[PDB]
Design a protein around this nucleic acid. Structure first.
Ligand SMILES: [Zn+2]
Ligand SMILES: [Zn+2]
Lengths: 118, 88, 50
RNA sequence: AAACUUUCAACAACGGAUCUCUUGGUUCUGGCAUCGAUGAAGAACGCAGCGAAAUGCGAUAAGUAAUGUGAAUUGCAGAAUUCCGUGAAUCAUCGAAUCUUUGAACGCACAUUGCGCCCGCCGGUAUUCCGGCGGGCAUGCCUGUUCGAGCGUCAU
RNA sequence: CGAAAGGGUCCUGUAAGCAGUAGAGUAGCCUUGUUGUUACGAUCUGCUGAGGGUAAGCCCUCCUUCGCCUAGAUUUC
RNA sequence: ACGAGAUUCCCACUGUCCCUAUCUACUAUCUAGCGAAACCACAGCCAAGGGAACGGGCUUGGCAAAAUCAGCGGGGAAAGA
RNA sequence: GUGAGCCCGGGUCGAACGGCCUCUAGUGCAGAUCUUGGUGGUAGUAGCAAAUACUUCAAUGAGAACUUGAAGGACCGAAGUGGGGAAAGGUUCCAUGUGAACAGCGGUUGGACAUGGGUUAGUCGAUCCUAAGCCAUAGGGAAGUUCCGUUUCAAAGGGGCACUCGUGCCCCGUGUGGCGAAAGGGAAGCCGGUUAAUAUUCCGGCACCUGGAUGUGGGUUUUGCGCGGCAACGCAACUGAACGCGGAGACGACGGCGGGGGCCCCGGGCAGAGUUCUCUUUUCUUCUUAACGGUCUAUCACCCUGGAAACAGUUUGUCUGGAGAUAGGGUUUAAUGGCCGGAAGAGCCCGACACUUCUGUCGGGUCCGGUGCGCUCUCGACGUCCCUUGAAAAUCCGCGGGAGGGAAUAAUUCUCACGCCAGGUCGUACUCAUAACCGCAGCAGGUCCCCAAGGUGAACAGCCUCUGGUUGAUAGAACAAUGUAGAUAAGGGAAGUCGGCAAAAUAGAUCCGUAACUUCGGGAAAAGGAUUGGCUCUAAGGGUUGGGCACGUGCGUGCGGUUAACAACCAACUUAGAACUGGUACGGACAGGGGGAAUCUGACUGUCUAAUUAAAACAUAGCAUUGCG
RNA sequence: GAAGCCAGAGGAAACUCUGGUGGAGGCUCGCAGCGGUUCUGACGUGCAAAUCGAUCGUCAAAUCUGAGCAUGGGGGCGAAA
RNA sequence: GAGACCGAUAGCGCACAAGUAGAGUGAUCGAAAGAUGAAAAGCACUUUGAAAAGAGGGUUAAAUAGCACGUGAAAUUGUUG
């Protein structure tokens, strides 16, 4: 049984675009099959972790699948992870509360200064 | 090994074919023809090579238009047709 | 090579059509001096120069 | 004595001198003024019934029209020419035309027959899709037109 | 005379195969060991100075076989 | 420490040698076919003499017999000398 | 005729030429290592000796070592003399025919010569992107050919709205174009068959991508733009302009570990073939499953409960945890994994008939396991190194925002399913080399990659073999000298020679042992020793599965116990020990350090005089000086 | 067989010793590749205007190598011959 | 239109399919090569050879002009004396 194979395209060099795998055909013959590069998982824009629930594809393959498969049903879903979204929510709430507290303190200081001047 | 063994490494091309003069003199990296000087507007010629001038001078090709000018001058660049000639 | 441009392939086509011996009726013409193809090319002998 | 080597002679070889030839050079003299964006010179690729080249020509392609001449062309094939003629010819002349891809080369490019844009026309079921065809789109500058910009100078 | 063969003389070192109460041990079957037995197992022993070679520049053979023969061509006081 | 760097020595080792011999393959050799080049004034045995420290040709002697084959490296030739 | 020369006879031949006096010159040859052309001796000479090798019969033909078929013998030995490519060539490819020339011998053969034939794509490339870099434009130089310039000292343009003082107004800022990769980036095609010669291109079957138009079903909505899960997130859909954010594209080298495909290996079974003096339930061959999809699963990670010292979990490699570990239960990235569709109808193997050809026809099968420090590709989690930190752009997607647009005359501007339409141009033969490229050639040189079987062995070492290729390199005979290449030699053992040049000796592995010196790392395999075959045994080193009651009813509890320290099944390679046995040899071929004492010298690794010098030369780290805000 | 790590034995601790683990280095033997040390080597009108054989240096990197691109003679490039 | 020019190694490099063939990466470099006969009348037919060709027999004024072709020197070679 002939076990040795050839490239099926005219590129003879072992480059990153020249990836092959070995198949056995229904005709009983060993052959190569040119394959594409592996997809890369999308990553969170804050921490850089791999986003769960999102497929790992080459970039143009995302144009062929539907919206619920490309995202997570949550704010920033498919772009930021759940932990980072929770951190954003807590930080936003606490910073706005502190802004209100600082505004109240500044108004009290302004009123005290106005009373001292008057 | 500067001779025969070194000669086995000669498989690139310094010059390709020039679109203007047809010679294998178009430097593939400089994009300048060594013979006719393309893509400069003027054709390259020098007075230190009378032979090179005479290889490409007027009359060495076809003269598709210029060869008919002396006859038209001899008849005075006339227009029209002979009198009574068949036609429109 | 197998990879070639259109211009190169056109020149190779012209060379292939030129590569022939002269027709035998040429030698029977009146006052003929052509005895063979003096510009005949072979792939081993003289390079096309492309 | 033969063979061999050398010498002499005849004939035969080898080779291309000599002689004669010359549609070619060389030099002098006389005449003439005419390349190109109306796309030249040069390059490439093609074109004949049977051609690779030389020669001629450009998809109207060894050529078309017109004028003249007046019976060929010829290597083969095949046809002629009402010869008392809108007419043979690889004929001459040449005022009308055709003139592929290029090239100063001009939509942008060209180591690609790569990629465009604008306006028409035609065809395919077609207001949308597909295809084909035609005409266009370089730069500098001049005259003019028209649309503009700036408290630059003013009038109101 | 030639080709075989036979005999001699030399060279190597005991052929293939079969057999063996030879063989370290191991595993089965049963009389559960009394060559217990059968199987395998380098090797050993016997048949067996056996087998193989031997003139190619070894020897002998009218009397061990088979074949060949008085040519052909060239030249010569 | 490291080294295809230069040098001296010891053990082992051996045909380096005493001292040469033998075997194999490919050549050389012979045949069929195929078939160059270098080089070439003319040629090729010596001895003595040939003032210019040189003879192959001259003088005087020795001598001296066709045509050849394998080798050889004195001489002549032979070093992009 | 002194002579340079002149004249005549004879032969050959075919078209012009001569004497005399003047005129005129490119006017007289043995040399110039003269120029061009032609030809000898040498000479039938040197030679046609690397790459192991050829033989028999038959056919063809005038003719056969180098044509073909068969029969034998060999070689390459998977880093090939194999199967395919990039550069370069350009028809050398295939068929038919062939005088000469060429194939340093022959030739019926040929990559030669002659006439013809052959290269089929939306999916493979080019075409697109940008890299290093190159060239226009503005503008400035230069007598000028032109030089710089590529974001500039440029008025370098996009979008929206408008019924009114109708012939306007508003918004925005970033600049600037092009070329540049058949190995970088990148949308999409697989299997079977088919030709003399092409095939991921033709034919059949089965798919995919991109773009466009417009329907049907389904979805959503009277709570107008879905629902479910505590959550990680899920599900066939499930609005989303400007302007923004983010992700993908998109990335080093090396080390060990784990998963998957393929290959290699072992066992059983059907069928076929070979062996068969004897033995061999034997040795060998076929036993396959693509793209594209569905479905169930697969390390990391993440979520929930809960709160850990008697610290625990845990990798070959020591990391992780009150910033929440272990445990228990979940969610997800990731298939070249299992099953199913494709798909047995294909391919392959075997058999029985038919058959001038045309042509075939019909049966039977194509199954079940196992193993691994194996080889190769791929994926994953780790780790190491850096005064080195290991592209860009086209392109695609998600989100933030909420502009618009949206319903019961039903509406829909739904990234869901199905349906409709379209996909141009160019390359595509063959060689890729001891004959298709370069070296003047069919030149032992040189020239970038992919696939890579069995045995021995540590091993893509050497040696032998299978598939697939070759058997091509002038032949025949003889066996002198001298050679080239390979060997052996008694006794002595460097007496040889300038010089131990060359050869010989050593060599793998296990074990014992190992000095000075030292920058403490080395020296070191120092040195010096013991051993190694075959056979029959013994011992050691592993994996998987599996616990009693009481109830409810295969799971839930509440218990009870750590002799499972036991059984059943399965499996591979190492290591140690012992007896027996042959011996001149036991790493039996192959493969494979001679060792030591010192001196000089350059620190080391590295680099150069291609084609006479490889070194104390150069470089190097370290050190020192000088200049510059 | 370098750091790092595990265990055991000590030491008041810092540390010391022993056995493992681990897999560093312009480290080392060596195949391919790259290079080019030696041989009274082959060849010397050669297979070759630099080739052939054996031997040798290096072999995880200051290693080897393709394509694209840049530097052009008053020049370039130069681990400098 | 001419010449007290050259007459195929001359004369232009080129009298000819010459700026061709061929060489070089490239700029560039750059040949050799004319003559059957008045007319192809370029050898029918026979014969020997596989063929190339040979011999007869022909064509021609001449093949002592056979597409190696006018004439046909020398070097050098074969046969005969
Ligand atoms: Zn995050
Ligand atoms: Zn040009």
């Amino acid at each position: 049984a002939p076990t040795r194979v050839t490239y099926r395209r005219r590129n003879p060099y072992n480059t990153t675009s020249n990836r092959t795998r070995v198949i056995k055909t229904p005709g009983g013959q060993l052959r190569v099959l040119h394959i594409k590069k592996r997809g890369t998982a999308p990553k969170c824009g804050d921490c850089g972790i791999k986003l769960p629930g999102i497929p790992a594809l080459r970039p143009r393959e995302y144009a062929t699948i539907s919206k619920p498969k490309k995202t997570v049903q949550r704010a920033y879903g498919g772009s930021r992870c759940g932990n980072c979204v929770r951190d954003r929510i807590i930080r936003a709430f606490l910073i706005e509360e502190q802004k209100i507290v600082k505004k109240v303190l500044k108004e009290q200081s302004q009123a005290e200064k106005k009373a001292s001047k008057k | 090994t500067k001779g025969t063994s070194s000669f086995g490494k000669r498989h690139n091309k310094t010059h390709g074919l020039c679109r203007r003069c047809g010679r294998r003199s178009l430097h593939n990296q400089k994009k300048v023809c060594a013979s006719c000087g393309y893509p400069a507007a003027k054709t390259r010629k020098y007075n230190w090579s009378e032979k090179a001038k005479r290889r490409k001078v007027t009359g060495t090709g076809r003269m598709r238009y210029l060869s008919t000018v002396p006859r038209r001058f001899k008849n005075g660049f006339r227009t029209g047709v002979p009198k009574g000639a068949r036609g429109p | 090579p197998s990879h070639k441009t259109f211009r190169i392939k056109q020149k190779l086509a012209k060379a292939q059509k030129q590569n022939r011996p002269i027709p035998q009726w040429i030698r029977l013409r009146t006052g003929n001096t052509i005895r063979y193809n003096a510009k005949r090319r072979h792939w081993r002998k003289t390079r096309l120069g492309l």
